[PDB]
Amino acid sequence: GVCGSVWGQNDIAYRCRTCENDPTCAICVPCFQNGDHNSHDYSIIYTGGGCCDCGDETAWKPDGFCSNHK
Amino acid sequence: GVCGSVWGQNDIAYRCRTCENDPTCAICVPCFQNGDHNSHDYSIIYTGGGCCDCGDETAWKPDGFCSNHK
Ligand SMILES: [Zn+2]
Ligand SMILES: [Zn+2]
Ligand SMILES: [Zn+2]
Ligand SMILES: [Zn+2]
Ligand SMILES: [Zn+2]
Ligand SMILES: [Zn+2]
């Protein structure tokens, strides 16, 4: 299932335009590192805060899920 | 900041088409009840799981935030 780690106003996370369902979706750094995005169009971003969409297939492509949320 | 409560495969949450940035965004039930959506086009939904977007203005309209995440 879904990770939902929360980052805050100034914390970084990962946007991955290849896996994302929508430009608003992001995942935490550990999820990103524990997955395979090797040729994806990803970027470090500062949203003003959010909760990790890893494990949520409406928001993110399953092959973009980390090991711990398959 | 952002709530990020996680619901699971069969758990309910709230979609609110008036506050939502995108059809993929949802918030947990307590956030929804602790906010004002009185004439909004909202529905109970079963995503297969997600994390609550309440408190995240890229995902959800601030006037749609609950008391505890303003
Ligand atoms: Zn995560
Ligand atoms: Zn993950
Ligand atoms: Zn990716
Ligand atoms: Zn919530
Ligand atoms: Zn809330
Ligand atoms: Zn609403």
Short mmCIF file of C-alpha atoms and ligand atoms in Angstrom, two decimals:
data_model
loop_
_atom_site.label_atom_id
_atom_site.label_comp_id
_atom_site.label_asym_id
_atom_site.label_seq_id
_atom_site.Cartn_x
_atom_site.Cartn_y
_atom_site.Cartn_z
CA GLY A 1 0.00 0.00 0.00
CA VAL A 2 0.63 3.76 0.15
CA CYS A 3 3.59 5.44 1.87
CA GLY A 4 2.25 8.90 2.82
CA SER A 5 5.44 10.20 4.48
CA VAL A 6 4.94 13.93 4.95
CA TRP A 7 7.49 16.57 4.05
CA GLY A 8 7.21 20.22 5.04
CA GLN A 9 7.40 23.76 3.67
CA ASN A 10 11.09 23.62 2.86
CA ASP A 11 11.70 19.89 2.51
CA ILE A 12 12.64 18.30 -0.78
CA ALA A 13 11.00 15.38 -2.51
CA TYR A 14 11.03 13.84 -5.99
CA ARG A 15 8.89 14.59 -9.00
CA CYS A 16 9.07 11.98 -11.74
CA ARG A 17 7.34 13.01 -14.94
CA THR A 18 7.59 9.48 -16.39
CA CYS A 19 5.79 7.74 -13.50
CA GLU A 20 3.49 10.52 -12.39
CA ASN A 21 -0.19 10.53 -13.09
CA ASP A 22 -0.37 14.30 -12.72
CA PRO A 23 2.15 17.14 -12.19
CA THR A 24 1.03 17.39 -8.55
CA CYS A 25 2.26 13.90 -7.51
CA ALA A 26 5.57 13.39 -5.72
CA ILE A 27 7.27 10.76 -3.59
CA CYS A 28 9.66 11.00 -0.63
CA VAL A 29 13.37 10.55 -1.16
CA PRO A 30 13.66 7.04 0.35
CA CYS A 31 10.87 5.72 -1.85
CA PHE A 32 12.60 7.28 -4.91
CA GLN A 33 15.98 5.77 -4.01
CA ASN A 34 14.43 2.36 -3.38
CA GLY A 35 12.97 2.35 -6.91
CA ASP A 36 14.14 2.35 -10.53
CA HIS A 37 13.81 5.63 -12.44
CA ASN A 38 17.10 5.42 -14.30
CA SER A 39 16.06 7.03 -17.58
CA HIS A 40 13.02 8.90 -16.27
CA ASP A 41 12.49 12.64 -16.42
CA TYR A 42 12.72 13.26 -12.68
CA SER A 43 13.65 16.30 -10.58
CA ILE A 44 14.20 17.26 -6.97
CA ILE A 45 11.42 19.69 -6.02
CA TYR A 46 10.25 21.82 -3.09
CA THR A 47 6.48 21.64 -2.92
CA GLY A 48 5.33 23.49 0.15
CA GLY A 49 4.65 20.09 1.66
CA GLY A 50 2.87 16.92 0.63
CA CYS A 51 2.46 13.22 1.35
CA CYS A 52 4.23 10.50 -0.66
CA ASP A 53 2.15 8.97 -3.46
CA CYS A 54 4.30 5.84 -3.68
CA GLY A 55 2.05 2.76 -3.55
CA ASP A 56 -0.99 4.61 -4.97
CA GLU A 57 -1.63 3.50 -8.53
CA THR A 58 -4.19 6.19 -9.25
CA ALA A 59 -1.35 8.69 -8.63
CA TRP A 60 1.76 6.84 -9.74
CA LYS A 61 2.80 4.09 -12.10
CA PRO A 62 3.37 0.73 -10.33
CA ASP A 63 6.72 0.19 -12.04
CA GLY A 64 7.60 3.48 -10.23
CA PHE A 65 6.86 2.03 -6.82
CA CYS A 66 9.68 1.36 -4.39
CA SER A 67 10.56 -2.11 -3.12
CA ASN A 68 8.60 -1.57 0.10
CA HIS A 69 5.30 -0.64 -1.57
CA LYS A 70 4.84 -3.22 -4.29
CA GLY B 1 0.99 21.52 6.94
CA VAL B 2 -0.09 18.28 5.24
CA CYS B 3 -2.08 15.47 6.88
CA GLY B 4 -1.02 12.34 4.92
CA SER B 5 -3.17 9.84 6.85
CA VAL B 6 -3.13 6.63 4.83
CA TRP B 7 -6.18 4.58 3.99
CA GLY B 8 -6.06 1.11 2.46
CA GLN B 9 -7.46 -1.02 -0.35
CA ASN B 10 -11.00 -1.06 0.98
CA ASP B 11 -11.09 2.07 3.12
CA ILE B 12 -13.23 5.05 2.26
CA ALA B 13 -12.19 8.66 1.95
CA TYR B 14 -13.64 11.86 0.50
CA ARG B 15 -13.38 13.29 -2.99
CA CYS B 16 -14.44 16.92 -3.27
CA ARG B 17 -14.67 18.16 -6.83
CA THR B 18 -15.01 21.79 -5.70
CA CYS B 19 -11.78 21.88 -3.65
CA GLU B 20 -9.73 19.37 -5.59
CA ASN B 21 -6.90 20.36 -7.85
CA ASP B 22 -7.18 17.12 -9.80
CA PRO B 23 -9.55 14.11 -9.82
CA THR B 24 -6.87 12.05 -8.05
CA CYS B 25 -6.85 14.09 -4.80
CA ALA B 26 -8.74 12.96 -1.72
CA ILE B 27 -8.75 13.62 2.01
CA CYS B 28 -9.41 11.38 5.02
CA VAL B 29 -12.78 11.43 6.72
CA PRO B 30 -11.73 13.39 9.84
CA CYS B 31 -10.17 16.15 7.76
CA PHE B 32 -13.41 16.32 5.66
CA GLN B 33 -15.62 16.48 8.75
CA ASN B 34 -13.44 19.16 10.34
CA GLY B 35 -13.89 21.38 7.27
CA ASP B 36 -16.65 23.23 5.41
CA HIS B 37 -17.83 21.69 2.12
CA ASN B 38 -21.52 22.37 2.59
CA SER B 39 -22.47 23.07 -1.03
CA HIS B 40 -19.53 21.31 -2.66
CA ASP B 41 -19.75 18.45 -5.13
CA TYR B 42 -18.24 15.81 -2.84
CA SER B 43 -18.51 12.01 -2.70
CA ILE B 44 -17.40 9.12 -0.55
CA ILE B 45 -14.94 7.07 -2.62
CA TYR B 46 -12.87 3.88 -2.42
CA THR B 47 -9.52 4.55 -4.03
CA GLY B 48 -7.34 1.51 -3.56
CA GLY B 49 -5.47 3.52 -0.97
CA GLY B 50 -3.92 6.97 -0.74
CA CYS B 51 -2.63 9.63 1.62
CA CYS B 52 -4.67 12.68 2.65
CA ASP B 53 -3.99 15.83 0.62
CA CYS B 54 -5.44 18.15 3.28
CA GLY B 55 -2.94 20.94 4.00
CA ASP B 56 -1.32 20.73 0.54
CA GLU B 57 -2.31 23.73 -1.54
CA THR B 58 -0.90 22.37 -4.77
CA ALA B 59 -3.44 19.54 -4.38
CA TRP B 60 -6.35 21.15 -2.58
CA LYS B 61 -7.94 24.54 -2.12
CA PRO B 62 -7.03 26.18 1.23
CA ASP B 63 -10.65 27.03 2.01
CA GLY B 64 -11.07 23.20 1.80
CA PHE B 65 -8.54 22.58 4.55
CA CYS B 66 -9.68 21.30 7.93
CA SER B 67 -9.25 23.27 11.15
CA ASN B 68 -6.09 21.33 12.06
CA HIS B 69 -4.23 22.06 8.82
CA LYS B 70 -4.73 25.76 8.22
ZN ZN C 1 7.52 7.45 0.43
ZN ZN C 2 7.68 3.50 -1.58
ZN ZN C 3 10.01 7.43 -12.62
ZN ZN C 4 -6.48 14.01 6.69
ZN ZN C 5 -6.94 18.31 7.63
ZN ZN C 6 -14.94 20.95 -0.84
#
